[PDB]
Design a protein around this ligand. Structure first.
Ligand SMILES: C[C@@H]1CCN(C(=O)c2ccc3c(c2)nc(CO)n3C)C[C@@H]1C(=O)O
Length: 167
């Protein structure tokens, strides 16, 4: 039993809700919140900009030190950093950005990072400003993640389309 509330159950391990992931995180304080990161951990917009703003830019400060030490992430890769005031940890995961010409096939590799954590709050990878079909993202998520994932879809209209179309 966990403290997530109001989710619709899609499969044995995947759940989905119309929610602002920032507000879900502040309420639940999950062990892991997933960020829709880029390889530079430049949290400018989308979910990343929103999460970082909620941390008063502490996420960006920590991220800049991470990059200075380690260099950029791989597309499809991830790193674990602090969750600041939102969660114990933030798993920064790089889904491919279709608006950069990045291979959509790497989306499965991106979701595989979720399997290293028993429970996560997460957005649909490569959706929103990353330019991929959020319906496809949900499909890859369900077919790749085996751990317990609580998916927040900010846009109510998209959420209804995701649920109604889910096979
Ligand atoms: C699936 C699709 C992809 C990208 N995406 C975002 O970039 C995103 C997420 C949360 C955000 C946000 C932008 N802007 C704010 C305002 O502070 N918040 C709380 C989520 C979006 C969705 O779930 O509808």
């Amino acid at each position: 039993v966990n403290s997530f509330s109001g989710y619709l159950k899609l499969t044995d391990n995947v759940y989905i809700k119309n929610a602002d992931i920032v507000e879900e995180a502040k309420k639940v304080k999950p062990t892991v919140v997933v960020n829709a990161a880029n390889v530079y951990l430049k949290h400018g917009g989308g979910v990343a900009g929103a999460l970082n703003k909620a941390t008063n830019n502490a996420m960006q400060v920590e991220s800049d030190d991470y990059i200075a030490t380690n260099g950029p992430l791989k597309v499809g890769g991830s790193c674990v950093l602090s969750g600041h005031n939102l969660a114990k940890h933030c798993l920064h995961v790089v889904g491919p950005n279709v608006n950069k010409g990045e291979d959509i096939q790497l989306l499965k590799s991106a979701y595989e990072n979720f399997n290293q954590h028993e429970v996560l709050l997460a957005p649909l990878l490569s959706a929103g400003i990353f330019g991929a079909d959020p319906i496809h993202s949900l499909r890859v998520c369900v077919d790749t993640v085996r751990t317990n994932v609580y998916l927040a879809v900010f846009d109510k209209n998209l959420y209804d389309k995701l649920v109604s179309s889910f096979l």
